[PDB]
Amino acid sequence: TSVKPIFSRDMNEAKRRVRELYRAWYREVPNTVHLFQLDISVKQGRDKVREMFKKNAHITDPRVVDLLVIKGKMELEETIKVWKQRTHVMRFFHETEAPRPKDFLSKFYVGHDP
Amino acid sequence: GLREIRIHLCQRSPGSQGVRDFIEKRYVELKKANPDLPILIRECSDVQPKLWARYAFGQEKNVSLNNFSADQVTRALENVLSSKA
Amino acid sequence: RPTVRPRNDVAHKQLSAFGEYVAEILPKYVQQVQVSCFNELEICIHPDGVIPVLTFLRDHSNAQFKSLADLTAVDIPTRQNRFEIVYNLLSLRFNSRIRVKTYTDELTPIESSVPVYKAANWYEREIWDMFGVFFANHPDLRRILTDYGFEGHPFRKDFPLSGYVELRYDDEVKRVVAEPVELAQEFRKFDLNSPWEAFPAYRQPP
Amino acid sequence: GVRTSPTGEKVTHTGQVYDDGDYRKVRFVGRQKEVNENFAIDLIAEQPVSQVGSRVISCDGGGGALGHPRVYINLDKETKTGTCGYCGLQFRQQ
Amino acid sequence: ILPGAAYTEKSATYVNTEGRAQQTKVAVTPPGLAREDWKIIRALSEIAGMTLPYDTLDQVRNRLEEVSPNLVRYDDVEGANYFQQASELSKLVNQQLLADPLVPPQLTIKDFYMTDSISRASQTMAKCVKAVTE
Amino acid sequence: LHHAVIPHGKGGRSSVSGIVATVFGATGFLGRYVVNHLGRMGSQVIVPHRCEPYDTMHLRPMGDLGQIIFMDWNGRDKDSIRRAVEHSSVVINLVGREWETQNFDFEDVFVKIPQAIAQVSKEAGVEKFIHISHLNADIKSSSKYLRSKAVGEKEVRETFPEATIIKPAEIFGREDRFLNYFANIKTVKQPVYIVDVTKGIINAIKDPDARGKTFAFVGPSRYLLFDLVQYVFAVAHRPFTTRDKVERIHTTDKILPHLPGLEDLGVEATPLELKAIEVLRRHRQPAKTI
Amino acid sequence: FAYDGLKRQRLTEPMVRNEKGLLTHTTWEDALSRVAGMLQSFQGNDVAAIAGGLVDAEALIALKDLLNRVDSDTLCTEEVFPTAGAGTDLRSNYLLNTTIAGVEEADVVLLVGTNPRFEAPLFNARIRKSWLHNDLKVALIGSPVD
Amino acid sequence: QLITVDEKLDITTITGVPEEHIKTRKARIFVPARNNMQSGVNNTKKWKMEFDTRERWENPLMGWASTADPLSNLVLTFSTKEDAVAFAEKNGWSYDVEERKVPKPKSKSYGANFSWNKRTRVSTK
Ligand SMILES: NC(=O)C1=CN([C@@H]2O[C@H](COP(=O)(O)OP(=O)(O)OC[C@H]3O[C@@H](n4cnc5c(N)ncnc54)[C@H](OP(=O)(O)O)[C@@H]3O)[C@@H](O)[C@H]2O)C=CC1
Ligand SMILES: [Zn+2]
């Protein structure tokens, strides 16, 4: 159970980097919506940022959290530097994907998938 | 009321020893008294013994028999056979 | 014999002697040394030894491996450390090549070798991009080959060949969009391996 | 051996034809269904049976190395002819 | 008519003559609008306001375990005991053997080829029946 | 169902939706969204067109290989209509024109042509027929455009009784002649979003309760035309056309409570405030709703 | 070789009877609504089920659970097994308790009222193998089949 | 310097796999059965991991087999079943493990073909 760390030596140290990343993303959305001339609202962009962070709330391994922060910072760098184009930013929102069926009966009617 | 009895037990685990004693000594007399009641005895290795009772409209309860003696097994059988849950 | 590749025992002996030489000088890091039947010398090291071993081979007077030919990874899922990091070096002084191998898993960083070879910069970015191995103290670690926002590391053995998403232009939103991949013709998997052993010399003990 | 279905679509040599209710035949509207008219099953049948004097004959399909792998055909059965599995030519022991 | 799935089109549990539970795997999906058989019943239960308490293959296999635990011990042959108790109950009620001789349903090979709906629809099985009778 | 039109796949480009649709007027504003949605889920779309093929090119990427089929047709030629529909399971009529030409009056476009399409489709055995009319269609309208819509709506109902008839308000969207109309410059309007109308049409094909019904497609809010035009100018950052069009623009949008609407098809109407920037960004305080 | 039956006479769509009494294709929604309507209107002995030979256990329990929820216990099979005495209470009453591989350890096999060659061809093959290699003695009560 | 980490290894959040192809898949871990058409046993040495089969449908244009399953062709190889299970566990796939089936050792005797008094005597060679 003795492993080499990435950046953080425990979850408290890792959770600091998560908060710093969240602040960076939070403050970047208004400029992203303007620079990329997106049609989403700033609230939508921040609501999307929060949703992305929240699906990873169950992680308790500091090394995994470190990589998520590492990857999250790369994504932020791609956005702030406009390496991404408009298509790449809007891919988070799945606008052309129709809503898949979630309940059992709906899934049963359309196909065989669980 | 009651519709079906099921008894699960292991073939060799000591925790099912009381259930094993009950079956070899009392099941035959139980079946004679309840001729038209399904009493599904199902042995499976390394399972904790259990007593499932199914009542009308698919309501089920399960009582654990682990480490029970043959007498406690009899008692649990009488409790289920007098209920209408 | 016209069709058989000739052996070269002189080079095999030289490379073997140098392999022991390296193992004697850096016992702290060298775990295995082997020379192939086509005379390629491989040094297998603990991952902590990346910088000391590469520096020694670059700078030592009897090595002088001044050129990093290639740096890459191999994914082997059955191993606890699934990623094998391979450094291929070239010594112009002694007209020789050597291969240095270490290992890592999904969560263990490897020290960046940019300080030793400036060539390592983009090779390590490629390894990160294609395999997800994180190199520590890289001047600029980020994707290099995949599309922006691309998820996953395609060269891992468990990443599907056609991936998870595909692109098309959508008129309603007037932009290229990404959607789950559907193929008009699924890639046809072939089972080609013969059920008869080909090479007794490599038979594994049962 | 091309014949047309009741709806007029030509039937291919593999027997393919869209049935009456198949929407997919809309692809031929204003265009055409490409069908090869030289049915190989019909053409090979026109070839005469070859009379030979031996129990076993060999066929390479003609043209030496431009034909097919050379195979040997047993002609002991008198009820039927020997048929080449590659090119369909028939042989009979006189 | 509710179109179900054949044994090649579902992952389903079958128990052989020894009581050994085994499971098939999906080779191809059911044709047309056909559906996995337990899913049909589960869907019917919901529309009827009596939803069954399982939504996945793993959950309905947890249900099987509650009824008969051996049904999820795949490839295992679980022993069964208490022949003495069964023979006692067998003697309680007297029944007479009929005078009829014991005659199996299948006396010759022609009776072997078609016994179920799948083999009755098989053109190969029909060719076998024709060959052994004519 | 014939085996070829049993749905398969996961609703994507390479899937089989089971829909075989002939879309008349597919080369216009509404048609490009309808074809896109049909081709998104893997439908077979037949596109009869009057224009040059160069003008249909934007529809080709909308479907997987073989899923968009183009045919020549003439509004006055019933044989060309029969060729286009005789293999389809649904026919969608989006033919229209905001003006009259030397060769086609509002009566041709909105009465004779819809009636011909509906009649041939009935003869050919098409199961479904979707006809677009107008919210303000009225025999007693000043607009000859709206008068012809009322006459045509009646004729389609008589010819194809099971037709689904959709009556949208003015439609706003990237290629509309509504928001773009004002930007290029008493009455209450209830404009509806192009994507909402498209989703309603697509859902009317699937919904078996839609047959024989008449729908009104309206946006969530009603505005005074003065309030709308002022808002349009503000969004376009600008300092704040036949005569028939003027009458249409000044016709108050009818309130038909007895007709089902977008909600009855499972579609939520999109507010003009969310999408106005999308339409008007290229011409570069919400309006008060009733 | 019977797998080619899987390509013939298949049920691919839900069907209900139309006004004229003929089966006609319909949606899953419609087919299940008709079945659910009747199911809600019956209880107890008015609802029964028969399972065929190729049915899987997952479906068997699902149908049993569904019928139990209307208080019906008439879950039947086509193949008969005497319910006299212990019936199905004890697995050993209706199992091949020796197991298939156990035939190779037997010294005498008594076959009663069976033609295992066609009922269980691979089981009969196991009997022949023990007959051939273990000198097993086999007796039969029933028709003298080959 | 090292740190202590007691959590079970889990990489599902950093592999990039869509959620659908983690939770709803079922990995099968097994040693492939010998192809009965051949006597060679060299394809039965290693452990394999494949996934549950999903829908394939006919392409309307050509009739080709289409699929929407990105994992339809994925097949991993492992030295042992522990390695395969370890891989499945850290990727979040639920799995079934089937124990390797090894042919049981047989007793062969050419001489038995000519037994004086046993049934093993062969009627033909
Ligand atoms: N857009 C709106 O605000 C509203 C529109 N509608 C109705 O919705 C339908 C479509 O709207 P929209 O898409 O804006 O209409 P468009 O004018 O944008 O496109 C009309 C379509 O009809 C075709 N068409 C027009 N005249 C003829 C003709 N004489 N012969 C053959 N084809 C012809 C055009 O093809 P070509 O390019 O070859 O001319 C084009 O594809 C119309 O019926 C319209 O009246 C109803 C309410 C609101
Ligand atoms: Zn030949």
- What residues form DSSP beta bridges with C86? C72, C101
What residues contact G103, with CB distance under 8 A and at least 6 apart? G109, G123, G126, G127, G130, G136
Q: Closest Cα partner for G133 from E106, F89, H113, F206?
A: H113
Tokens of F2: 């014939």
Query: What are the CB-based long-range contacts (under 8 Å, 24+) for D33-40?
Result: D33/D9, D35/D2, D35/D10, D36/D12, D37/D2, D39/D1, D39/D2, D39/D13, D40/D13
Q: Which residues of C162-201 are buried (b: 16+ CB within 10 A; e: fewer)?
A: bbbbbeeebbbbebebbbbbbbbebeeeeeeeeeeeeeee
Q: Closest Cα partner for F138 from F38, F230, F251?
A: F251
Alpha-carbon separation of residue A56 from A15, A61, A69, F152, G46 (angstroms)? 12, 11, 11, 57, 53
* F219 within ligand 1 shell (Cβ under 6 A): no
Instruction: Please tell me the distance from the alpha carbon of residue D88 to that of residue D73, in angstroms, as a whole number.
Output: 12
Tokens of D24: 């997919």
Q: Closest Cα partner for G58 from H24, E52, E1?
A: E52
Q: Are D13 and D7 in contact (CB under 8 A)?
A: no
Check CB contact under 8 Å for H58 and F67.
no
What residues contact G139, with CB distance under 8 A and at least 6 apart? G108, G109, G110, G111
In chain A, residues with a C-beta closer than 8 Å to the C-beta of E55 are 104
**Nearest atom in ligand 1 to F172's CA:** 3
Q: Which of F95, F174, F197 to mutate to test the pocket of ligand 1 (most atoms within 8 A of CB)?
A: F95
* F70 within ligand 1 shell (Cβ under 6 A): no
Residue of F nearest to A97 (CA): F12
- First-to-last C-alpha distance (Å) of chain E: 37
* CB-CB neighbours of C152 under 10 Å: 20
Q: Which residues of E87-103 are buried (b: 16+ CB within 10 A; e: fewer)?
A: ebbeeeeeeeeeeeeee
* φ/ψ (deg, to 5) at G110: -105, 115
* φ/ψ (deg, to 5) at C146: -85, 165
- First-to-last C-alpha distance (Å) of chain G: 23
Instruction: Please tell me the distance from the alpha carbon of residue H53 to that of residue C186, in angstroms, as a whole number.
Output: 13
Instruction: Please tell me the distance from the alpha carbon of residue E90 to that of residue G86, in angstroms, as a whole number.
Output: 7
Check CB contact under 8 Å for F5 and D27.
no
Three-point CA angle D23, D28, D31, nearest 5°:
160
**Nearest atom in ligand 1 to F27's CA:** 41
Residue numbers after which chain G is interrupted (C to N above 2.5 A) read: none
Q: Are C87 and C101 in contact (CB under 8 A)?
A: yes
Please tell me the total count of domains within chain A. 1
Instruction: Please tell me the distance from the alpha carbon of residue E19 to that of residue E35, in angstroms, as a whole number.
Output: 27
Tokens of F210: 């839609």
D15/chain F closest Cα distance in angstroms: 18
The CATH number of residue B45's host domain is 3.40.30.10
- Side-chain half-sphere of E100: how many Cα atoms within 13 Å? 5
Instruction: Please tell me the distance from the alpha carbon of residue G142 to that of residue G113, in angstroms, as a whole number.
Output: 5
Q: Which of F22, F27, F30, F36 to mutate to test the pocket of ligand 1 (most atoms within 8 A of CB)?
A: F30
Instruction: Please tell me the distance from the alpha carbon of residue F27 to that of residue A108, in angstroms, as a whole number.
Output: 36
Residue found by looking up tokens 């692809």 in the block: D27
Instruction: Please tell me the distance from the alpha carbon of residue B55 to that of residue F186, in angstroms, as a whole number.
Output: 71
* F25 within ligand 1 shell (Cβ under 6 A): yes
- Side-chain half-sphere of D48: how many Cα atoms within 13 Å? 3
Residue of minimum CA distance from atom 1 in ligand 1? F171
Q: Helices F113-124 and F78-85, interaxial angle, to 10°?
A: 50
- What residues form DSSP beta bridges with F47? F70
Q: Which of F32, F35, F50 to mutate to test the pocket of ligand 1 (most atoms within 8 A of CB)?
A: F50
* F68 within ligand 1 shell (Cβ under 6 A): no
Calculate the dihedral angle through the C-alpha atoms of B50, B51, B55, B59, rounding to the nearest 10 degrees. -20
Q: The domain containing residue A79 runs over which residues?
A: 1-114
Instruction: Please tell me the distance from the alpha carbon of residue D15 to that of residue C108, in angstroms, as a whole number.
Output: 61
Instruction: Please tell me the distance from the alpha carbon of residue C164 to that of residue C182, in angstroms, as a whole number.
Output: 9
Check CB contact under 8 Å for A108 and G28.
yes
Q: The domain containing residue F221 runs over which residues?
A: 1-290
What residues contact H17, with CB distance under 8 A and at least 6 apart? C152, C164, H91
Check CB contact under 8 Å for A67 and H14.
yes
Instruction: Please tell me the distance from the alpha carbon of residue C30 to that of residue C41, in angstroms, as a whole number.
Output: 13
**Nearest atom in ligand 1 to F26's CA:** 41
* F28 within ligand 1 shell (Cβ under 6 A): yes
Say how far residue C150 (Cα) sits from the centre of its chain: 22
Cα-atom radius of gyration of chain H, to the nearest Å? Answer: 23
- First-to-last C-alpha distance (Å) of chain A: 36
Contact status of F14 with chain H (Cβ, < 8 Å) = yes
Q: Helices A11-35 and A62-80, interaxial angle, to 10°?
A: 20
Q: Which is it for strands B60-64 and B50-55: parallel, antiparallel or unpaired?
A: antiparallel
Check CB contact under 8 Å for G25 and F3.
no
Tokens of E129: 């029946």
Q: Are A89 and A49 in contact (CB under 8 A)?
A: no
* F116 within ligand 1 shell (Cβ under 6 A): no
Instruction: Please tell me the distance from the alpha carbon of residue B67 to that of residue B46, in angstroms, as a whole number.
Output: 13
Instruction: Please tell me the distance from the alpha carbon of residue F146 to that of residue F224, in angstroms, as a whole number.
Output: 20
Instruction: Please tell me the distance from the alpha carbon of residue F182 to that of residue F160, in angstroms, as a whole number.
Output: 37
Query: Strand, helix or coil at G137?
Result: strand
Instruction: Please tell me the distance from the alpha carbon of residue C134 to that of residue D90, in angstroms, as a whole number.
Output: 70
F126/chain D closest Cα distance in angstroms: 12
Instruction: Please tell me the distance from the alpha carbon of residue E11 to that of residue E39, in angstroms, as a whole number.
Output: 12
Instruction: Please tell me the distance from the alpha carbon of residue C22 to that of residue C31, in angstroms, as a whole number.
Output: 11
Query: What are the CB-based long-range contacts (under 8 Å, 24+) for B81-85?
Result: B81/B2, B81/B34, B83/B1, B83/B2, B83/B53, B83/B55, B84/B1, B84/B2, B84/B55, B85/B1, B85/B53, B85/B55, B85/B59, B85/B61
* CB-CB neighbours of D54 under 10 Å: 10
* φ/ψ (deg, to 5) at G74: -90, 65
Please tell me the total count of domains within chain B. 1
Q: Which residue type occupies F221? A: S
* F173 within ligand 1 shell (Cβ under 6 A): no
What residues contact E1, with CB distance under 8 A and at least 6 apart? G11, G14, G15, G16, G23, G31
Instruction: Please tell me the distance from the alpha carbon of residue A101 to that of residue E43, in angstroms, as a whole number.
Output: 14
Q: Closest Cα partner for F147 from F233, F56, F247?
A: F247
Name the closest ligand to CA F52.
1
In chain F, residues with a C-beta closer than 8 Å to the C-beta of C179 are 12-13
Q: Are D9 and D27 in contact (CB under 8 A)?
A: no
Q: Which residues of B31-48 are buried (b: 16+ CB within 10 A; e: fewer)?
A: beeeeeebbbbbbbeebe
Instruction: Please tell me the distance from the alpha carbon of residue C138 to that of residue C127, in angstroms, as a whole number.
Output: 12
* F51 within ligand 1 shell (Cβ under 6 A): yes
Instruction: Please tell me the distance from the alpha carbon of residue E59 to that of residue E56, in angstroms, as a whole number.
Output: 5
H30/chain E closest Cα distance in angstroms: 13
* φ/ψ (deg, to 5) at H16: 80, 5
Instruction: Please tell me the distance from the alpha carbon of residue F134 to that of residue F154, in angstroms, as a whole number.
Output: 12
Instruction: Please tell me the distance from the alpha carbon of residue H93 to that of residue E4, in angstroms, as a whole number.
Output: 28
Q: Which residue type occupies C42? A: E
* F155 within ligand 1 shell (Cβ under 6 A): no
Query: What would the DSSP string read from start to end of chain H?
Result: --EE--SPP--TTTS---THHHHS-EEEEEPPPPPTT----GGGSSEEEEE----EEE-TTT--EEE--TTTT--EEESSHHHHHHHHHHTT-EEEE-PPP-PPPP---GGGGG-SSSTT--S--
| Burial (CB count <10 Å: 0-12, 13-18, 19+), residue C10 | exposed
Instruction: Sort residue H94 into left (φ over 0), alpha (ψ -120 to 50) or beta.
Output: beta
Please tell me the total count of domains within chain F. 1
Instruction: Please tell me the distance from the alpha carbon of residue D61 to that of residue D51, in angstroms, as a whole number.
Output: 16
CA of C64 to the centre of ligand 2 (A): 66
Q: What is the 3-state secondary structure (H, E, C) of chain F?
A: CCHHHCCECCCCCCCECCCEEEEECCCCHHHHHHHHHHHHCCCEEEEEECCCHHHHHHHHHHCCCCCEEEEECCCCCHHHHHHHHCCCCEEEECCCCCCCCCCCCHHHHHHHHHHHHHHHHHHHCCCEEEEECCCCCCCCCCCHHHHHHHHHHHHHHHHCCCCEEEEECCEECCCCCCHHHHHCCCCEECCEEHHHHHHHHHHHHHCCCCCCCEEEECCCCCEEHHHHHHHHHHHCCCCCCCHHHHHHHCCCCCCCCCCCCHHHHCCCCCCHHHHHHHHHHHHCCCCCEC
Q: Helices E57-67 and G57-68, interaxial angle, to 10°?
A: 70
In chain H, residues with a C-beta closer than 8 Å to the C-beta of E29 are 53-56
Instruction: Please tell me the distance from the alpha carbon of residue E10 to that of residue E36, in angstroms, as a whole number.
Output: 6
Instruction: Please tell me the distance from the alpha carbon of residue C50 to that of residue C61, in angstroms, as a whole number.
Output: 19
Instruction: Please tell me the distance from the alpha carbon of residue G16 to that of residue G38, in angstroms, as a whole number.
Output: 13
C165/chain F closest Cα distance in angstroms: 12
Q: Are B34 and B80 in contact (CB under 8 A)?
A: no
Q: Are H27 and H4 in contact (CB under 8 A)?
A: no
Contact status of G112 with chain H (Cβ, < 8 Å) = no
Query: Strand, helix or coil at E90?
Result: helix
D24/chain F closest Cα distance in angstroms: 8
| Burial (CB count <10 Å: 0-12, 13-18, 19+), residue E69 | buried
Tokens of E75: 């490839």
Q: Are F93 and F24 in contact (CB under 8 A)?
A: yes
Q: The domain containing residue B25 runs over which residues?
A: 2-82
Residue of minimum CA distance from atom 11 in ligand 1? F30
Instruction: Please tell me the distance from the alpha carbon of residue H122 to that of residue H125, in angstroms, as a whole number.
Output: 7
Query: What would the DSSP string read from start to end of C90-133?
Result: EETTTTEEEEEEEEE-SS--EE--TTT-TTHHHHHHHHHHHH-P
